[PDB]
């Protein structure tokens, strides 16, 4: 065994140790005799023998001496496999710099010499000298000299100045670094300079120097004086048929390097002139650079082809970018594929398998069984029987297939559900038969899809297939507890048609003694499928745990509902099946049955539902005909009216009265209203388009029109599509996004004109083009999500912490978006839950909330609860099994070893393909309550609230808040806390239209410095619209009026100076430009009076932005520290708003440029959490100021809005898991034990602080600040280098690991995947634990 794969620089001595010879000849194989030549790229002396256990001459052919090397044949006789491990070396006449440590964005060789990459490139390209060992001379070691400059320096000095050129000079510089002295000097000079940029550069210098010192790495090794050569089979020449040979790019590059090296030696040995020698050295540097990588500087090309050569960097990068196609993809055996086909006679656990595919896949199993039964003696006979397809081979094939599950997956597997185990059944054909109910999970229709089939071999593999990924096990979606193996289109249609009702039908009225009599009457044809009848039933209810009570009851229902209830298992009431059985109702029924009865009865119920749905959709000859699309009669009248209106509006525009810009909006609004009215009329006609006779007088009933059934049942189609099918198509958008001024009046039944078809083509082309980019972005996003959240696996059971996130129902707006029940279902409680009256414990502790608990919480008036979240659970290297709540694919709590991180990433990324103001008006009646409001009462009781943080809530009678609204600054509210307000009332009468400035104090104000023409302007509007004064702009004012700002000095009614609480200075708010101060100076202004009034995306890109924690073009400016805010000096061009908190004055405040509008009013509480200027928030400021839980709530809500817009439901556990993975790193402020500023894992800092507490001193513990990293940045910054190297930027991370000397302990999922070990999660957890037991404990 082994562990902890290391990475470091290759020493010339260790490079020699690796090699088995010195490659010296460029050519590979002689054209006359086809054996590799001496000292060539395939020489037998170096790389090994061509034929296993053979030599060059054949002197020794026996298989006995496997290590002896013959006398005439120096090529040691050994196995042919050895050509894969044996490498050689090339001795270069001069050293050449390594391309990776040169051209990486932070140049390691440049950083180690404190000289810019440009200067090093000048030296390497033989353009300028560099100075080595300055000695006692004016020249410095870092000084570069030109030809004339160097000649002058040599003439002036003569000696004591070693100046060189090329990579030889760089090598001479590197080995004279004296890393100890440089580290000491740079550490001494690190705190001397207070510049942030310089301190950052010297900190990076320190990091590199300490990495080199600790890692046992030598700086001179960066410039390789000797380079290896790949073993011949890893750079093979695959002979083309016809005697041609196909040479790999590696062979071409190696040949080029060898040729240039041989040229170098034989031109230095004859003392060629300096210019040509330096040109040859440059060529050798370029050739080695092209061998190592390409396109960085030179972009070398091949012969007679514009395609660049493939270097080793591109080889290790793999295909598909950096996603290793050989170490992660790894085409497998015992596999096949074919087109899929629906099999309606299949049970949920089994799938059809063609005879030939099954016979080919299970061939070794068939051979084994044939030999065991003795029917075949030699394997040749077994092959003859299996190829003859003798009748007895089908019996043994059936025996090997009986209990051997197989794996089926679609091409894009967006989640674990995309590959499930099926117990194959032999079928006659070439297509793979699929169960209809698993198509939804696979997202696989039968329009040409193909599926790959894989045969697990080991008993471990078969048991994992049967116990974890058998199709019956995964009924519920891992993304949300809602079922995924649910009736789809056709079976939903059948079940819906069965459970309908007709006003008058054959067989209506009589009573049936049992469901059996109902079936007997229906099959005999004496009763309609949907006829209102009476039937008594024997339902067994599971109301009490462990006690199944059966009761007999007579229910008024239909024949179809009674028939379908005969399928329902024995734990559910009949009332669950007495409705119309729409798709959502059926899905909820399956979900309820799973959580009540079990799993086996649930799969039986699902199979029975599918069978009956198919049977009764076949019995009902439902069909689509031209008469089914019922065009409403009023559509013609509505269209004519709208055409008359648009003609009138066009005439008005021609008159010039109406502007084109307003006419566009008017006509689009008119046409949208007409389209909505037409659609409403069509739906109202279609839905009730049934007139029936009930023993005389005619009556109406729900329609039996086929298209209406297909919509209402939810089987297939939507109202938006019937809007096109039977109503006007409505407005359509031009490619620029502007809605075309004329709509499509015709529907698909009437047929569109040519122009309308062309517009619909605009729309359809836009959508179809968007689809492919949506798929690509979703794939990239889910790949990044998986690679950032893979190491997270449940390890502990209960971490022990009591921190979590306060979860409350999402009530953004007037309606409840998500009830509290759905948010905390399957979660775990973090603290006590209390009644409306305290001291009464409802939910004690971390009890996993289930259906019973959510019903209990709904019965009580619990509104806000705190639950344990993965962002909590401070356990190290994993997550506790509580803080990650109930598993979603299973009904119970998660089990140790569940890779919830990968499940989270798959859950978030799977539905990506589905992606792309004055006053408050209370909705319903409820007791109004205030939250986070800080305002004093007005003179008359207006209660104007100037605080920016504040909201208005209308709590229900029970106590839960039914609706909440954001109350803005300066809002007058008729405070009636505890007094119920009727629905539609306007309790708060805010009307900002401006930035009002409240006046918390009263008295006769003293507007000091109000200059009419310099600071203010008594400009009155027309018709005496305002008796006020307009403040003069700072630049529009005079030279002296530019610096003068109006100030309303705080005085009382008699002239007494007043000041705001907390600060001695008065609340004399300045009046800036564009102000509205109506109150006369010296007039008593009431408390809260308005003094100064100043007038003021979505889809996959948005969720990607949130998961990368990006900064938009204009981020929202937020307050830094809570306290007394000030005014920003606009003269300097950037507003500086100093903050003076009452608890402690901190004068530090940044300057915000006035390029973006700032809506901040001075003289109020800063409220660090609050916002200073509008705009989309920058995830960071929220994290570093509001906290972690606040950032968690904001990010979760932001992602969930995007997902809920398309109606896809995803549990928040997954988003919180990804958030935990991103917040995994923290930066340190005052270390005492580490570097000043460093990005270290929070686990590392926590461990260091815990050890320091019980250690040398007590102050050794470090203080740190949490930092947020994007997924593409958090994934590349992992401690393991193998995980990052196979994600992205392989070169950068590999060079960083090389210089840093990183070690990778294979303790993640991808590490064990690439190295071929058992996964540290799932069933490999036991193996990993035993390995840890045997390793750590001796």
């Amino acid at each position: 065994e082994f562990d902890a794969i290391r990475i470091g620089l290759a020493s010339p001595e260790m490079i020699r140790s690796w090699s088995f010879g010195e490659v010296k000849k460029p050519e590979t194989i002689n054209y006359r005799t086809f054996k590799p030549e001496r000292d060539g790229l395939f020489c037998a002396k170096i790389f090994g023998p061509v034929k296993d256990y053979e030599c060059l001459c054949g002197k020794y052919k026996r298989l006995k001496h496997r290590g002896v090397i013959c006398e005439k044949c120096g090529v040691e006789v050994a196995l042919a496999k050895v050509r894969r491990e044996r490498m050689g070396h090339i001795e270069l006449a001069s050293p050449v710099a390594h391309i990776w440590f040169l051209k990486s964005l932070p140049s390691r060789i440049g950083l180690l010499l404190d000289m810019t990459l440009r200067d090093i490139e000048r030296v390497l390209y033989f353009e300028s000298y560099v100075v080595i060992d300055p000695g006692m001379t004016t020249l410095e070691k870092g000084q570069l000299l030109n030809d004339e400059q160097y000649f002058e320096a040599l003439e002036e000095f003569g000696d004591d100045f070693d100046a060189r050129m090329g990579a030889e000079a760089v090598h001479e510089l590197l080995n004279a670094i004296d890393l100890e002295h440089e580290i000491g000097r740079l550490r001494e000079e690190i705190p001397q300079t207070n510049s942030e940029t310089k301190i950052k550069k010297l900190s990076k210098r320190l990091k590199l120097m300490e990495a080199f010192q600790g890692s046992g790495n030598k700086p001179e090794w960066m410039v390789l004086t000797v380079l290896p050569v790949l073993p011949p089979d890893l750079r093979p020449l695959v002979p083309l048929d016809g005697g041609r040979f196909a040479t790999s790019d590696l062979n071409d590059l190696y040949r080029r390097v060898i040729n240039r090296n041989n040229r170098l030696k034989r031109l230095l040995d004859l003392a060629a002139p300096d210019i040509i020698v330096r040109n040859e050295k440059r060529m050798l540097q370029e050739a080695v650079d092209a061998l190592l990588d390409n396109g960085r500087r030179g972009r070398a090309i091949t012969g007679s082809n514009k395609r660049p050569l493939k270097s080793l960097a591109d080889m290790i990068k793999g295909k598909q970018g950096r996603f290793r196609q050989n170490l992660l993809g790894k085409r497998v055996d015992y596999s096949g594929r074919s087109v899929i086909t629906v099999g309606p006679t299949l049970r949920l656990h089994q799938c059809g398998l063609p005879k030939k595919m099954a016979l080919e896949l299970f061939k070794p199993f068939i051979f084994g069984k044939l030999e065991g039964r003795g029917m075949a003696t030699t394997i040749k006979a077994a092959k003859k029987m299996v190829e003859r397809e003798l009748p007895e081979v089908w019996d043994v094939l059936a025996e090997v297939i009986r209990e051997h599950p197989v794996l089926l997956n679609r091409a894009p597997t967006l989640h674990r559900l995309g590959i499930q185990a099926f117990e194959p059944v032999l079928i006659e054909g070439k297509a793979i038969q699929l169960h209809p109910l698993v198509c939804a999970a696979y997202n696989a229709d039968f329009d040409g899809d193909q599926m790959a089939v894989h045969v697990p071999l080991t008993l471990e593999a078969q048991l994992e297939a049967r116990a974890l990924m058998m199709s019956t096990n995964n009924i519920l979606s891992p993304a949300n507890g809602e079922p995924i193996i649910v009736p789809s289109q056709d079976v939903v249609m059948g079940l819906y048609y069965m459970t309908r009702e007709a006003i008058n039908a054959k067989g209506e009225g009589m009573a049936f003694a049992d469901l059996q009599e109902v079936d007997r009457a229906y099959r005999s044809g004496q009763a309609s499928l949907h006829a209102r009848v009476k039937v008594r039933i024997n339902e067994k209810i599971k109301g009490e745990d462990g006690q199944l009570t059966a009761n007999t009851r007579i229910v008024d229902t239909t024949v179809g509902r009674a028939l379908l209830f005969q399928v329902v298992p024995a734990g559910l009431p009949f009332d669950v099946v007495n409705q119309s059985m729409k798709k959502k109702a059926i899905s909820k029924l399956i979900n309820h049955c799973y959580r009540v009865v079990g799993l086996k009865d649930t799969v039986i119920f699902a199979d029975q539902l599918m069978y009956t749905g198919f049977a009764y959709s076949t019995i009902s000859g439902v069909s689509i005909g031209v008469n089914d699309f019922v065009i409403p009669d009023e559509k013609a009248r509505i269209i004519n009216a709208a055409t008359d209106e648009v003609k009138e509006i066009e005439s008005q525009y021609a008159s010039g009265l109406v502007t084109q810009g307003e006419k566009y909006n008017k006509v689009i609004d008119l046409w949208s209203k007409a389209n909505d009215e037409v659609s409403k009329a069509m739906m109202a006609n279609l839905s009730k388009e049934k007139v029936v006779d009930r023993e005389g007088k005619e009556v109406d009933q729900e329609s039996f029109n086929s298209m209406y059934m297909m919509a209402d049942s939810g089987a297939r189609g939507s109202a938006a599509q019937i809007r096109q099918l039977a109503g006007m198509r409505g407005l359509m958008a031009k490619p620029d996004g502007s809605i075309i001024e004329t709509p499509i009046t015709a529907n698909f039944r009437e047929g569109l004109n040519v122009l309308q078809y062309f517009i619909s083509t605009h729309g359809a082309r836009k959508g179809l083009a968007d689809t492919a980019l949506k798929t690509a972005n979703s794939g990239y996003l889910t790949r990044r999500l998986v690679d950032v959240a893979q190491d997270l696996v449940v390890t502990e059971i209960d971490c022990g912490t009591e921190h979590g996130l306060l979860m409350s129902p999402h009530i953004e707006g007037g309606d409840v978006v998500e009830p509290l029940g759905e948010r905390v279902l399957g979660r775990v409680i973090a603290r006590d839950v209390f009644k409306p009256g305290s001291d009464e414990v409802i939910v004690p502790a971390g009890t996993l909330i289930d259906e019973k608990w959510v019903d209990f919480l709904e019965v009580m008036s619990v509104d806000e609860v705190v639950v344990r979240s993965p962002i909590t659970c401070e356990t190290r290297h994993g997550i506790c099994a509580m803080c990650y709540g109930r598993d979603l694919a299973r009904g119970h709590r998660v089990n140790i070893g569940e890779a919830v991180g990968v499940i989270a990433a798959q859950s978030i990324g799977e539905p990506g393909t589905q992606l792309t103001a004055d006053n408050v008006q209370v909705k319903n009646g409820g007791t109004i309550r205030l939250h986070n409001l800080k305002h004093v009462v007005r003179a008359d009781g207006a209660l104007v609230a100037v605080s920016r943080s504040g909201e208005l809530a209308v709590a229900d009678d029970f106590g839960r808040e039914r609706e909440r609204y954001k109350l803005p600054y300066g809002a007058v509210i008729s405070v009636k806390e505890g007094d119920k307000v009727d629905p539609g009332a306007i309790v708060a009468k805010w009307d900002p239209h401006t930035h009002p400035i409240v006046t918390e104090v009263d008295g006769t104000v003293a507007f000091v410095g109000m200059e009419e023409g310099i600071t203010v302007k008594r400009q009155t509007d027309e018709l005496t619209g305002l008796t006020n004064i307009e403040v003069m702009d700072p630049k529009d004012r005079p030279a002296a009026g530019k610096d003068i700002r109006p100030a309303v000095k705080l005085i009382d009614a008699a002239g007494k100076d007043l000041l705001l609480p907390g600060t001695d200075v008065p609340a004399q708010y300045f009046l800036p430009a564009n102000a509205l101060v109506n109150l006369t100076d010296g007039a008593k202004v009431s408390i809260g009076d308005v003094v100064a009034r100043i007038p003021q995306t979505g889809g996959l890109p948005r969720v990607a932005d949130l998961f990368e924690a990006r900064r938009p073009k204009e981020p929202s400016i937020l307050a830094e520290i809570s306290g007394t805010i000030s005014f920003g000096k606009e003269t300097k061009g950037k507003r500086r708003l100093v903050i003076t908190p009452n608890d402690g004055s901190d004068p530090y405040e940044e300057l915000i440029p006035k390029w973006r509008h700032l809506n901040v009013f001075e003289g109020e509480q800063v409220n660090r959490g609050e916002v200073i200027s509008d705009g989309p928030s920058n995830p960071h400021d929220i994290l570093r100021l509001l906290g972690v839980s606040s950032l968690a709530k904001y990010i979760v809500n932001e992602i969930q809005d995007v997902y809920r817009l398309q109606g896809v439901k995803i549990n928040d556990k997954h988003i919180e898991t990804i958030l935990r993975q991103m917040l995994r790193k923290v930066e340190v402020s005052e270390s005492g034990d580490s570097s000043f500023i460093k990005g270290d894992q929070v686990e590392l800092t926590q461990v260091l602080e815990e050890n320091e507490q019980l250690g040398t001193e007590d102050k050794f513990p470090a203080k740190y600040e949490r930092v947020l990293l994007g997924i593409t940045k958090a994934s590349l910054s992992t401690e393991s280098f193998i995980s990052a190297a196979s994600f992205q930027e392989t070169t950068r991370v590999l060079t960083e690991a090389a210089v840093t000397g990183k070690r990778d302990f294979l303790r993640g999922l991808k590490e064990n995947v690439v190295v071929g070990r058992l996964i540290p999660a799932g069933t490999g957890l036991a193996y990993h634990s035993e390995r840890k037991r045997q390793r750590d404990l001796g």
Partner: protein
């Protein structure tokens, strides 16, 4: 910050300019002057002259060919007369080994116009540099011995010892200087003296002293440096020709720089085998060698 290597090759080479054919004649005259100087230096080494007499004896005994020994002057019968004269000069110089110095100067004058095949040139160079290597090795041996054992100071080392290396005068003088280091030297008298006996044997083989051999080898080195400088000037002149001719074979399955470097090697070979008395332009002869080099390079890569 151009990254194109061809571009910087053009920049660095573009400083030098061409020259008319009289300039080529002058450069070839410089080459001839250097080789004449080094050959005249070789004349002051009796072993080399005896070796050229032996090669002539092989010529007469048909052990060597006319084209494998001589390369003209500034038919074998003129060679007969010239080597008879040089042998008579050698014998008259050896007879009176004062006036012997004048006799060797006349010997160098007579052997000065002669020109020989490069193989014999490298043989003569190998002999003289081997004598130099022996002297230098004795220097290093004595130096490491005394410095690392007796701690005898480097100042008196580089003051009194040099240029004799053969007589007991320096050992005795250091012994009479009476430091403790001279007392420690007495343990190392035997090895140093027997190595100096070998040096004296080498000198008696060559009949010359250390200072004389140093003078001749220094003059030969100066002549070689002059010839090397002339060749450098000439090849830097013809770099333009080599790039111009290298244009023909770009897409021949080989890089441009490899082609021009092989053509450069060919043109240095051409310079090594170019004479001005042919009365021809250089380009005519350089084209053949450059074509040979480039074509062979491309043929090797098939």
């Amino acid at each position: 910050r151009t990254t194109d290597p061809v571009r910087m090759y053009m920049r660095e080479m573009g400083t030098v300019e061409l020259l008319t054919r009289e300039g080529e004649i002058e450069i070839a005259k410089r080459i001839e002057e250097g080789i004449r100087e080094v050959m005249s230096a070789i004349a002051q080494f009796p072993g080399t002259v005896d070796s050229i007499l032996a090669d002539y004896n092989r010529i007469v005994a048909e052990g060597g060919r006319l084209s494998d020994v001589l390369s003209g002057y500034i038919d074998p019968e003129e060679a007969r007369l010239r080597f008879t004269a040089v042998s008579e000069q050698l014998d008259k110089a050896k007879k009176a080994l004062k006036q012997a110095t004048a006799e060797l100067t006349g010997l160098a004058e007579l052997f000065m116009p002669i020109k020989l095949v490069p193989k014999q040139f490298d043989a003569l160079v190998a002999r003289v540099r081997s004598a130099l290597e022996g002297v230098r090795a004795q220097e290093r041996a004595i130096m490491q011995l005394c410095v690392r054992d007796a701690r005898m100071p480097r100042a008196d080392f580089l003051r009194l010892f040099p240029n004799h290396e053969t007589d007991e005068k320096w050992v005795d003088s250091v012994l009479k200087s009476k430091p403790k280091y001279a007392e420690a030297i007495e343990r190392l008298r035997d090895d140093i003296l027997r190595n100096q006996q070998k040096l004296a044997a080498l000198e008696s083989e060559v009949e010359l002293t250390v200072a004389e051999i140093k003078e001749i080898n220094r003059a030969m080195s100066i002549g070689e440096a002059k010839a090397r400088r002339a060749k450098k000037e000439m090849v830097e002149a013809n770099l333009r020709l080599v790039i111009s001719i290298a244009k023909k074979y770009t897409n021949r399955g080989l890089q441009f720089l490899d082609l021009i470097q092989e053509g450069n090697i060919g043109l240095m070979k051409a310079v090594d085998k170019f004479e001005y008395r042919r009365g021809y332009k250089f380009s005519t002869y350089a084209t053949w060698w450059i074509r040979q080099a480039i074509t062979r390079s491309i043929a090797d890569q098939a």
